[PDB]
Coordinates of C-alpha atoms in Angstrom, one line a residue:
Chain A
X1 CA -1.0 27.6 -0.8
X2 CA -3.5 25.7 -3.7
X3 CA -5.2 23.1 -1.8
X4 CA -6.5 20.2 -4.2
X5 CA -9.3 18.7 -2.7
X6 CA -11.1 14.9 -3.7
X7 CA -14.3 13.1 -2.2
X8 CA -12.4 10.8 0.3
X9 CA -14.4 7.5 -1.1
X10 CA -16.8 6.4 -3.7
X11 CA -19.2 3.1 -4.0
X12 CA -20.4 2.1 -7.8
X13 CA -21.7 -1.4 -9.0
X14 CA -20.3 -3.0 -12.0
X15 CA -21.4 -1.5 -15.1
X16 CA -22.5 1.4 -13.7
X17 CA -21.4 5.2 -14.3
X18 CA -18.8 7.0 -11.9
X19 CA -17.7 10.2 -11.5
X20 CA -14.5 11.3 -9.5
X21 CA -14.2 15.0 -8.6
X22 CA -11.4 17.5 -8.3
X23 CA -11.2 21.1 -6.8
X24 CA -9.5 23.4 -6.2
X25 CA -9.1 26.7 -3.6
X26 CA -7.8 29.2 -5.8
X27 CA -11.3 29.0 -7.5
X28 CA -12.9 27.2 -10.5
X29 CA -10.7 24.7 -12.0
X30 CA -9.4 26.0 -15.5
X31 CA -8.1 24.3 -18.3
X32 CA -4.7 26.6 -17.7
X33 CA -4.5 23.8 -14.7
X34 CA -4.0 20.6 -16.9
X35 CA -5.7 18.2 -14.8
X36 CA -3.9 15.0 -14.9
X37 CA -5.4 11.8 -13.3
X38 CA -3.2 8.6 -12.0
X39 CA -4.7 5.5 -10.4
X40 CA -2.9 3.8 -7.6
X41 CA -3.6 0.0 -7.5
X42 CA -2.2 -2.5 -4.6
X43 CA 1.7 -2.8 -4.5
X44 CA 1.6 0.9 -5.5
X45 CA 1.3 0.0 -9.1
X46 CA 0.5 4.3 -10.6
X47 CA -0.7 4.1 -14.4
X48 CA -1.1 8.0 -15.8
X49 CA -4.6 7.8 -17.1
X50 CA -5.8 11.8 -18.1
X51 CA -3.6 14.3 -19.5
X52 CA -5.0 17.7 -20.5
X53 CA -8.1 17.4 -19.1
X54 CA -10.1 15.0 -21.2
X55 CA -6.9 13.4 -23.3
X56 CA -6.9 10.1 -22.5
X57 CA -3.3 8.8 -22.2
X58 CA -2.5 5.6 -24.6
X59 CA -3.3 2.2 -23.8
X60 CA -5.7 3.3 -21.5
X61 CA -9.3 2.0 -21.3
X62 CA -12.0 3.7 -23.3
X63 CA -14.2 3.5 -20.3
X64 CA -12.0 6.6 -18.6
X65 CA -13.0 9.8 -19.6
X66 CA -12.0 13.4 -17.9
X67 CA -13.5 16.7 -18.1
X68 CA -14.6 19.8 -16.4
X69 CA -17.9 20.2 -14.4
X70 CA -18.5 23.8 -13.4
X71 CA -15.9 24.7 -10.9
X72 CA -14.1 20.9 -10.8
X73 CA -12.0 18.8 -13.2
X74 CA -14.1 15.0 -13.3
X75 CA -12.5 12.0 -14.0
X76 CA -16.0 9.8 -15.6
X77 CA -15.7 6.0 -15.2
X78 CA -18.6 4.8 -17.5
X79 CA -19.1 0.8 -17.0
X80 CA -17.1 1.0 -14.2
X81 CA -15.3 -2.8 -13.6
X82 CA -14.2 -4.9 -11.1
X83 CA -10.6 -3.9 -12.0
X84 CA -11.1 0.3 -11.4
X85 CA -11.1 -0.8 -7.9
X86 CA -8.2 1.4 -7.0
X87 CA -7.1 5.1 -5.7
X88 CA -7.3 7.8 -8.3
X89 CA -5.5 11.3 -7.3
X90 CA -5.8 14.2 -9.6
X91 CA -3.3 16.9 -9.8
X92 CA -3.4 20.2 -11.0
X93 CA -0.8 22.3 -13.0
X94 CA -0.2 26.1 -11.1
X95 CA 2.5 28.4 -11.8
X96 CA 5.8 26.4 -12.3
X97 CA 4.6 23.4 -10.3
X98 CA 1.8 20.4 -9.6
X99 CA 0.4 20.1 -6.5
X100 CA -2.0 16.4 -6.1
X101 CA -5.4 16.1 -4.1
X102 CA -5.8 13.6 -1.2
X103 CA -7.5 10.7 -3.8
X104 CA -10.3 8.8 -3.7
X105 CA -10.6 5.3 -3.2
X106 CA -12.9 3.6 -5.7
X107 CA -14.9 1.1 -3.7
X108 CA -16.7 -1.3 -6.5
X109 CA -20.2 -2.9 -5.2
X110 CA -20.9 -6.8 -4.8
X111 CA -23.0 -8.9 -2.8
X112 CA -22.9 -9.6 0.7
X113 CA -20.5 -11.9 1.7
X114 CA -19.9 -13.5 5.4
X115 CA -16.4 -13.8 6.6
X116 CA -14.9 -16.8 7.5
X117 CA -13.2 -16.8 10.7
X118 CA -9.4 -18.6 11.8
X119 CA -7.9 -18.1 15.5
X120 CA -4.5 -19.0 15.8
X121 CA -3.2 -19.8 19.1
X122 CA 0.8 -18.5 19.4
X123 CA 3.5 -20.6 17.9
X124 CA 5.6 -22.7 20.6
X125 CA 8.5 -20.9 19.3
X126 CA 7.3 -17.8 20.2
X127 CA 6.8 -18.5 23.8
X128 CA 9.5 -19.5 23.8
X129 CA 10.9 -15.6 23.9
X130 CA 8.2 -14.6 26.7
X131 CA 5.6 -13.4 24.6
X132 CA 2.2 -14.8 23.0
X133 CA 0.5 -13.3 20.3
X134 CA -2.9 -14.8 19.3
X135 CA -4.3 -13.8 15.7
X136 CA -7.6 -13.7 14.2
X137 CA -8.2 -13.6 10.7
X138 CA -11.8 -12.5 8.8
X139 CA -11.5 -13.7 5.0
X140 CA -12.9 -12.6 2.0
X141 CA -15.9 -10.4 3.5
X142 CA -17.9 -7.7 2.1
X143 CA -19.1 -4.9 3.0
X144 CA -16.0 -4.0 4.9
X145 CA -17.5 -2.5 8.3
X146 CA -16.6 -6.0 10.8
X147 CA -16.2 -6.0 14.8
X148 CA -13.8 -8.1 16.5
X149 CA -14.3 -8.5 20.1
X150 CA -11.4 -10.2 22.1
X151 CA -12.1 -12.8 25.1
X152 CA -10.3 -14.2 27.4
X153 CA -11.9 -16.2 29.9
X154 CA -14.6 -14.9 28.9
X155 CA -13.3 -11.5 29.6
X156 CA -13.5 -8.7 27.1
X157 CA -10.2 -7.8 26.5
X158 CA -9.4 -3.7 25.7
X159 CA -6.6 -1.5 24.8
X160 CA -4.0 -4.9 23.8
X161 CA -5.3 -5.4 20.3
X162 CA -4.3 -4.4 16.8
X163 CA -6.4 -4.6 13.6
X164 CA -5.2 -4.4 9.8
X165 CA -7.0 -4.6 6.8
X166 CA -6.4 -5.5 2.9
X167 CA -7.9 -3.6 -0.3
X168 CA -10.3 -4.2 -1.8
X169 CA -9.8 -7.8 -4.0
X170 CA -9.2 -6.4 -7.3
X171 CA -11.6 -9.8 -8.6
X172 CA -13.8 -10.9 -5.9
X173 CA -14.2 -7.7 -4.2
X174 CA -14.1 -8.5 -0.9
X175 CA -11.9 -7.5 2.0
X176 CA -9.7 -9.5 4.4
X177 CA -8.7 -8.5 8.3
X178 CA -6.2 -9.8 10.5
X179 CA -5.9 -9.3 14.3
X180 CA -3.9 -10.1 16.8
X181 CA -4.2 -9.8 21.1
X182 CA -0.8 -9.7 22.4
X183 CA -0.1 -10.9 26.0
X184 CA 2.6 -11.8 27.8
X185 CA 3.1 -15.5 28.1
X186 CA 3.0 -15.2 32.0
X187 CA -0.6 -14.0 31.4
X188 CA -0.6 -16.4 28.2
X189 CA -0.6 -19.1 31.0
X190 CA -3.2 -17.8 33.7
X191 CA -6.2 -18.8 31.0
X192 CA -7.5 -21.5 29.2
X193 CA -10.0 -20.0 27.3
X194 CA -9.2 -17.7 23.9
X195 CA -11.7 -16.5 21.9
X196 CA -12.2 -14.2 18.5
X197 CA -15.7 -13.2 18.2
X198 CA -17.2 -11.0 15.1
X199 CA -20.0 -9.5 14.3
X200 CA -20.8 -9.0 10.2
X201 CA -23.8 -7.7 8.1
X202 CA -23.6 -11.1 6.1
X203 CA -23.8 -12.6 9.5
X204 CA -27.1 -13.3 11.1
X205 CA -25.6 -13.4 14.9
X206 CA -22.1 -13.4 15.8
X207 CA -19.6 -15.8 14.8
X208 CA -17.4 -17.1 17.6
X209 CA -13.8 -19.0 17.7
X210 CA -12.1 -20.1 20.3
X211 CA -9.5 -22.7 21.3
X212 CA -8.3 -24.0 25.0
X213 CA -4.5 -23.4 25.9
X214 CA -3.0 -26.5 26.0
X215 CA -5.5 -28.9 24.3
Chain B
X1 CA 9.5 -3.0 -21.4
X2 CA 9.5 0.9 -19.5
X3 CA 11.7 0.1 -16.1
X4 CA 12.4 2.7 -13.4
X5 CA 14.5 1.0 -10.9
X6 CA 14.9 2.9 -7.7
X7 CA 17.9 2.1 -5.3
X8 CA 19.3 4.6 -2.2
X9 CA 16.8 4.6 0.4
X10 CA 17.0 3.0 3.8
X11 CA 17.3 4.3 7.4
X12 CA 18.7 7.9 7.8
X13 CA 19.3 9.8 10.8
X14 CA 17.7 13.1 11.9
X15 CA 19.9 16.0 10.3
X16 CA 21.7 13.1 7.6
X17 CA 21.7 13.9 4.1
X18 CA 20.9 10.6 1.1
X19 CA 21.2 10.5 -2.3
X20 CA 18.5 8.3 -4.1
X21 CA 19.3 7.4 -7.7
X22 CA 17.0 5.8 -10.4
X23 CA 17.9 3.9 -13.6
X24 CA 15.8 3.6 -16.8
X25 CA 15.3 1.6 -19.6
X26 CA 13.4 1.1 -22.5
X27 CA 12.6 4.2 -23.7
X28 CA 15.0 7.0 -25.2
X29 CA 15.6 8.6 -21.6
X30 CA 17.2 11.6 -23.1
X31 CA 14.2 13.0 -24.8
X32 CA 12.2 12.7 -21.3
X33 CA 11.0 15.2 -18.5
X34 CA 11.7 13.4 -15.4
X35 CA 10.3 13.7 -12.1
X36 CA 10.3 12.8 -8.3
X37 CA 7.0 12.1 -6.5
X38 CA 7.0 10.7 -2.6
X39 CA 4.1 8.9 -0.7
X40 CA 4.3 9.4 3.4
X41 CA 2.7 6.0 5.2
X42 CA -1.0 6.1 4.8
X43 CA -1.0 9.4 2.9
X44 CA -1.3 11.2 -0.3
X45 CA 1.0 11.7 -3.4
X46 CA 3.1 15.0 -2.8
X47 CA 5.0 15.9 -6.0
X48 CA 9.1 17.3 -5.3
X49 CA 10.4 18.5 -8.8
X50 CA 11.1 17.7 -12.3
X51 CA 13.9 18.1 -14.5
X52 CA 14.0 18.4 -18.4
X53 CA 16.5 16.5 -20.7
X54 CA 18.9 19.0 -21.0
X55 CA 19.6 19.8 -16.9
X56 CA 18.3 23.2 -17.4
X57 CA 14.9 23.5 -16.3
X58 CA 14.6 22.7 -12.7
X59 CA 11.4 23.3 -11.3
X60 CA 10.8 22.5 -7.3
X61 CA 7.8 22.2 -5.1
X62 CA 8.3 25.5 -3.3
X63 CA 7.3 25.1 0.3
X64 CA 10.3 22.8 0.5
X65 CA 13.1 24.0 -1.5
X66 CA 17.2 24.5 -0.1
X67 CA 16.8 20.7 1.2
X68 CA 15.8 18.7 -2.1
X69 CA 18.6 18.6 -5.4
X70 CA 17.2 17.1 -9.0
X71 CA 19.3 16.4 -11.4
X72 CA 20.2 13.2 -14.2
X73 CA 23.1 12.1 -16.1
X74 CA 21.6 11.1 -19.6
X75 CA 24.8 9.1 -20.4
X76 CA 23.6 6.4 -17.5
X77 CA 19.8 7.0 -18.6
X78 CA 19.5 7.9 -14.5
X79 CA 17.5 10.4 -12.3
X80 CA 19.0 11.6 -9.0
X81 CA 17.7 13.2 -5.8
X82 CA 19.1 14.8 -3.3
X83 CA 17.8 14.8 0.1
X84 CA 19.4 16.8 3.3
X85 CA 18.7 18.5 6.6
X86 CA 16.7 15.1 6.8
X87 CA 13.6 15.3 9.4
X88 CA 10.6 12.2 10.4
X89 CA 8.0 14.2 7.6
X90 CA 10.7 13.4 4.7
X91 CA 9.9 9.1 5.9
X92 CA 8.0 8.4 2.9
X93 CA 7.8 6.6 -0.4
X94 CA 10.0 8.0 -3.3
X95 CA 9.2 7.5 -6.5
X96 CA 10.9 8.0 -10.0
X97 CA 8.4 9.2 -12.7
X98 CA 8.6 10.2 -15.8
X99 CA 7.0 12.5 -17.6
X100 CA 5.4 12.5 -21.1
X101 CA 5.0 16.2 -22.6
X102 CA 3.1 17.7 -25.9
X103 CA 3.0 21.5 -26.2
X104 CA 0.8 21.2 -29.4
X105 CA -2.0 18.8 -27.7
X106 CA -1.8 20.7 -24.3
X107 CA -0.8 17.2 -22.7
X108 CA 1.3 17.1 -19.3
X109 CA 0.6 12.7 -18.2
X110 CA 3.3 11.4 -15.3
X111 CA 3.0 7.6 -17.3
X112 CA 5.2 5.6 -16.1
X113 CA 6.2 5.3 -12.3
X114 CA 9.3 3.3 -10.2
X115 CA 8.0 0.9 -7.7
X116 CA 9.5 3.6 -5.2
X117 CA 12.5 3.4 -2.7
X118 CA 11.3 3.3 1.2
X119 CA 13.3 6.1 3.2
X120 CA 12.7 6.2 7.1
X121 CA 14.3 8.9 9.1
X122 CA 14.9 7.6 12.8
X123 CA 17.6 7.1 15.1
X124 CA 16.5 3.9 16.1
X125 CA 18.6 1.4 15.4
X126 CA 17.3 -1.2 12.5
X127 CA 15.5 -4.4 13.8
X128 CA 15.5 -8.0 12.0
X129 CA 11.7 -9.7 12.7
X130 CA 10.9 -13.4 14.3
X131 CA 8.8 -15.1 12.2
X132 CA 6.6 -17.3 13.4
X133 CA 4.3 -19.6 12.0
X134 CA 0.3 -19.6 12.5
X135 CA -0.5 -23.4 11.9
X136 CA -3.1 -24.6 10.0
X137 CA -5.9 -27.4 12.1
X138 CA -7.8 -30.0 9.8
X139 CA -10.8 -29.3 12.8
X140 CA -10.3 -25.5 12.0
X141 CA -12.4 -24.8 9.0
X142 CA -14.5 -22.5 7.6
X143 CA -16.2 -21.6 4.4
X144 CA -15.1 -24.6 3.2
X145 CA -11.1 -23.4 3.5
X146 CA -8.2 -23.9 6.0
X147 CA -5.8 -21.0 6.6
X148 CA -2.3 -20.7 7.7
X149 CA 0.0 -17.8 8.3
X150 CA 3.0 -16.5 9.3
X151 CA 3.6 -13.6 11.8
X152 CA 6.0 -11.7 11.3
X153 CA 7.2 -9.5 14.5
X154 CA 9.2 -7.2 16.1
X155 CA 11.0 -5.5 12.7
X156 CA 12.4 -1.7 12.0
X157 CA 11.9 -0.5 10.1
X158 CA 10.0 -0.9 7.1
X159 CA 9.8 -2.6 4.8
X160 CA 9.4 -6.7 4.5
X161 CA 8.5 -8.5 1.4
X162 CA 6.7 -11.6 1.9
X163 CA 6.1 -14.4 -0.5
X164 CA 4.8 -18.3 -0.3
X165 CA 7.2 -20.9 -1.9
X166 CA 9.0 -18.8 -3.8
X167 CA 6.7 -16.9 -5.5
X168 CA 5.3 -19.8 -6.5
X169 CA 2.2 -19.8 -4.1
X170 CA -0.2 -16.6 -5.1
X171 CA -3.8 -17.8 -4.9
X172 CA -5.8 -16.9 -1.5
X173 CA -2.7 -15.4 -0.2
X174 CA -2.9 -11.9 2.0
X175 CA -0.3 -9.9 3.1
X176 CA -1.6 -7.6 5.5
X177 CA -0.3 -3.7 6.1
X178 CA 2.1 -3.8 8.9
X179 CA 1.0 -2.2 12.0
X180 CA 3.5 -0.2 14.7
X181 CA 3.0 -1.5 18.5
X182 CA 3.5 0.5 21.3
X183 CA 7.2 -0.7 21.6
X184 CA 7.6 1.1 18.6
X185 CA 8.4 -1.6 16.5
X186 CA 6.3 -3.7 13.6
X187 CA 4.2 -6.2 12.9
X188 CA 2.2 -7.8 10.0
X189 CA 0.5 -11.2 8.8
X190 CA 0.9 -12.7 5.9
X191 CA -1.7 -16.0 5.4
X192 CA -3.0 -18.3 3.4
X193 CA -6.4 -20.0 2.4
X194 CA -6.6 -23.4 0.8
X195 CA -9.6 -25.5 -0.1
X196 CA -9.7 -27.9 3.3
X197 CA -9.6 -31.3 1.8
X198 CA -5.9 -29.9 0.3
X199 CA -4.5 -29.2 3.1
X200 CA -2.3 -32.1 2.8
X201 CA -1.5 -32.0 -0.5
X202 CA 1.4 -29.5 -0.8
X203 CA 4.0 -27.8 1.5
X204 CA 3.9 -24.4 3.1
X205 CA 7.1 -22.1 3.3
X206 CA 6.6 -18.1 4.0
X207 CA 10.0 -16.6 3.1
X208 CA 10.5 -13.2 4.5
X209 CA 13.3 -10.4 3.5
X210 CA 14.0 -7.9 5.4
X211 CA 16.6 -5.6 4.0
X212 CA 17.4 -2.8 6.3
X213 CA 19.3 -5.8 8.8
X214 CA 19.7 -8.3 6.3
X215 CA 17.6 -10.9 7.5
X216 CA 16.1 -13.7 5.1
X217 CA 14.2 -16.4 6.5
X218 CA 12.1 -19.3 5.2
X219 CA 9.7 -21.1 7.4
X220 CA 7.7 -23.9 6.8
X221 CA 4.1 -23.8 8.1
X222 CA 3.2 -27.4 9.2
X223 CA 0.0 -28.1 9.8
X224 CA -0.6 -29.4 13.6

């Protein structure tokens, strides 16, 4: 059983030189293998790039390059751009069939950037149907690590709280996350006070939200 | 252009057999390798088989073979596949792929790819979501934007498509990956960030499809 294997994720700065790696169990990548690359972008939107090897497929990029590197088949990025931001997967040709390693997420560098912060309290509608869900949004931060802490009367909430995160921006880079604490609206009615609080690199202490049920 | 349009997938029961199809265009289809590649939620590419232009070669992914059927019909320039003795592993992704070969340059690329047909395998019964909108405050600013949203909960099983006016609406929009709750149902976000001294200045409508129990909604998003 041929187990591809890929580093999981990758960091590069514009204009900068990347290399993606692929390897295999069976032993040393082989030319006999045919390494072929494919990039994944958002929507699932697969573009073949590497064919062969190192034969670039048409209409792609210059900048993409593959090859072999002792043991592994290498996919080079050289002057990497915001737009490579993406998954690449290589997969290798054995016997009859082509079996695809795990990909690696191309993560491309950028400045620090604070998130801003949104808490929605729930919709009328909603409660009317006997549930409240309040969200929390982070926009357009980088680097991606962010912690969201949940309040509620100035209660840390636990264990009633799911998170969800974009891709990378394919042109400012940055990430977006969504949150949302989901009470009933019996409980929805017990407190006043709801509050989103994150903590951020870009952020020099904590940035708190908050609204008051009924005001 | 190259289109691979996908069609057949939806919910299946446990032990059910489907049959996904895929129509091209574009390109001379009977000249063409073709091949079937699936994505499981949050996981990687796993490759099922490939047919040749003449129906001949067959070639299968081994460790899960007497359960998947390839094959084509060049006269309607489509791909078919077979899927039976369906189990919650085969939920995935499917997509149609073709693929370009070249014996003399020792050249094997999959170039071109379907946008993929969602199959879940459940015996849950399908779910429409509420949608419910996440209103924008003139006093709730930051970074010098205003967001608003829609939530849209309570679905099965995947997928919805989300869009803002139309279509018409794609700047500092975000469509976030649903999540599953505990009930066992879905949930996802989709918002909107606007420069805050626009808020005003234009209307707000999420429209959200949801196939699988034929549910199309469009809300508007008032601010308030």
């Amino acid at each position: 059983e041929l187990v591809v294997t890929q580093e999981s994720a990758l960091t590069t700065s514009p204009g900068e030189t990347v290399t993606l790696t692929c390897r295999s169990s069976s032993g040393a990548v082989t030319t006999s293998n045919y390494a072929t690359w494919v990039q994944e972008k958002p929507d699932h939107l697969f573009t073949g790039l590497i064919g062969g090897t190192n034969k670039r497929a048409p209409g792609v990029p210059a900048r993409f390059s593959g090859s072999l590197i002792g043991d592994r088949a290498a996919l080079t990025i050289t002057g990497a751009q915001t737009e490579d931001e993406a998954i690449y997967f290589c997969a290798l040709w054995n016997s009859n069939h082509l079996v695809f390693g795990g990909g690696t997420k191309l993560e491309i560098k950028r400045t620090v950037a604070a998130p801003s912060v949104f808490i929605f309290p729930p919709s009328d509608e909603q409660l009317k149907s006997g549930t409240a869900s309040v969200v929390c949004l982070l926009n357009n931060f980088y680097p991606r690590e962010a912690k969201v802490q949940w309040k509620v009367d100035n209660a840390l909430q636990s264990g009633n709280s799911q998170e969800s995160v974009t891709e990378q921006d394919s042109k400012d880079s940055t990430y977006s996350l969504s949150s949302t604490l989901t009470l009933s609206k019996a409980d929805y009615e017990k407190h006043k006070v709801y509050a989103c609080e994150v903590t951020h690199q870009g952020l020099s202490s904590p940035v708190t939200k908050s609204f008051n049920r009924g005001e | 252009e190259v289109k691979l349009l996908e069609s057949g997938g939806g919910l299946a029961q446990p032990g059910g057999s489907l049959k996904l199809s895929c129509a091209a265009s574009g390109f001379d289809f009977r000249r063409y390798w073709m091949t079937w590649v699936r994505q499981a939620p949050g996981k990687g590419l796993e490759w099922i088989g490939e047919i040749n232009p003449d129906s001949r070669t067959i070639n299968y992914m081994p460790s899960l073979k007497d359960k998947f059927i390839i094959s084509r019909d060049n006269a309607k320039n489509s791909l078919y596949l077979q899927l039976s003795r369906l189990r919650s592993e085969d939920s995935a992704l499917y997509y149609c792929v073709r693929l370009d070969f070249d014996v003399y340059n020792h050249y094997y690329v999959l170039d071109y790819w379907g946008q993929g047909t969602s199959v879940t395998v459940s015996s849950a019964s399908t779910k429409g979501p509420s949608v419910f909108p996440l209103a924008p405050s003139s006093k709730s600013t930051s970074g010098g934007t205003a967001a608003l949203g829609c939530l849209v909960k309570d679905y099965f099983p995947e997928p919805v498509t989300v869009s803002w006016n139309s279509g018409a609406l794609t700047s500092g929009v975000h469509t976030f990956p649903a999540v599953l709750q505990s009930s066992g149902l879905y949930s996802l976000s989709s918002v909107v960030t606007v420069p805050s001294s626009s808020l005003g200045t234009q209307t707000y409508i999420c429209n959200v499809n949801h196939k699988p129990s034929n549910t199309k909604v469009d809300k508007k998003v008032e601010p308030k």
